[PDB]
Paper text:
Of particular interest are the Esx complexes which are dimers of two subunits (ESAT-6, early secreted antigen of 6 kDa; and CFP-10, culture filtrate protein of 10 kDa) and which are secreted across the cytoplasmic membrane by Type VII secretion (T7S) systems. Mycobacterial ESX secretion systems have been shown to be involved in a variety of physiological processes including conjugation in a non-pathogenic mycobacterium, iron and/or zinc acquisition by both pathogenic and non-pathogenic mycobacterial species, and virulence of pathogenic mycobacteria. The overall architecture of the complexes is similar to known Esx structures in that each heterodimer forms a four helix bundle with the CFP-10 and ESAT-6 subunit homologs each contributing an α-helical hairpin to the complex. The subunit interfaces in the four-helix bundles of the Esx complexes are similar to those of the previously determined Esx complex structures in that the intermolecular interface between the CFP-10 and ESAT-6 subunits is largely hydrophobic.
A crude low resolution model of the SeMet-labeled EsxEFma complex was used to obtain a molecular replacement solution for a high resolution (1.96 Å) EsxEFma native dataset and a second crystal form of EsxOPmt, solved by molecular replacement using the EsxOPmt model from form I, at 2.55 Å was also obtained. The asymmetric units for the EsxEFma crystal forms have a single complex in the asymmetric unit for the SeMet-labeled protein and six complexes in the asymmetric unit of the native protein crystal form while the EsxGHms and EsxOPmt (both crystal forms) contain two heterodimeric complexes. The WXG-containing loops are well ordered in the EsxGHms complexes and in most of the EsxEFma complexes but the majority of the connecting loops are disordered in the EsxOPmt subunit structures. Additional regions of disorder are found at the N- and C-termini of the complexes with the EsxFma and EsxOmt subunits having a substantial number of disordered residues at their C-termini. The average amount of buried surface area in the subunit interfaces varies considerably [EsxEFma, ∼1605 Å2; EsxGHms, ∼1555 Å2; EsxOPmt (form I), ∼1025 Å2; and EsxOPmt (form II), ∼1175 Å2] and the percentage of the surface of each subunit buried in the complex interface is also highly variable, from 13.5–33%, and is related to the degree to which the termini of the subunits are ordered and to the conformations that they adopt. Shape complementarity (Sc) statistics of 0.77 for EsxEFma, 0.74 for EsxGHms, and 0.69 and 0.71 for EsxOPmt forms I and II, respectively, indicate that the interfaces are highly complementary, with biologically significant interfaces such as antibody-antigen interactions generally having values in the range of 0.65–0.85.
Numbering used by the authors:
A (entry chain B): 4 to 38, 54 to 95
B (entry chain A): 12 to 69
């Protein structure tokens, strides 16, 4: 299962990190093409998106760690 | 032509959106299933933000 697979979980984190990176890049270009409250709304939507993608990334990494932790906490000895 | 750029960058952003939904579906178990209300809310909130950007670009 996916959530019992530290390696798959850490791979997917990768993919989500790449999406964050892509969307950060497209935001900077897009903000540039935009040359003040409409600007705020866009800036905000962009950040919201990048944060969600950071969450999944941090969540998957945390979970991959914690699963490895559950395993070693019940073998040591 | 500065309008063309913005529209294009938007199409580009919309492709990203779609690529992310395909990955959220592939990582559906993270939210306790791809069909879980946790997953669908994530998606719904994702669309709300892309919609904002899309709108103001068009």
């Amino acid at each position: 299962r996916f959530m019992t697979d530290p390696h798959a979980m850490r791979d997917m984190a990768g993919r989500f990190e790449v999406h964050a990176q892509t969307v950060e890049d497209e935001a900077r270009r897009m903000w540039a093409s935009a040359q003040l409250d409409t600007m705020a709304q866009m800036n905000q939507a962009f950040r919201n998106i990048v944060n969600m993608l950071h969450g999944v990334r941090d969540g998957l990494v945390r979970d991959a760690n914690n699963y490895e932790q559950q395993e070693q906490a019940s073998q040591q000895i | 032509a500065h309008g063309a750029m913005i529209r294009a960058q938007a199409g580009l952003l919309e492709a990203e959106h779609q690529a992310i939904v395909r990955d959220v579906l592939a990582a559906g178990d993270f939210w306790g299933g791809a069909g879980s209300v946790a997953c669908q809310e994530f998606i719904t909130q994702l669309g709300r933000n892309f919609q904002v950007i899309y709108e103001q670009a068009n």
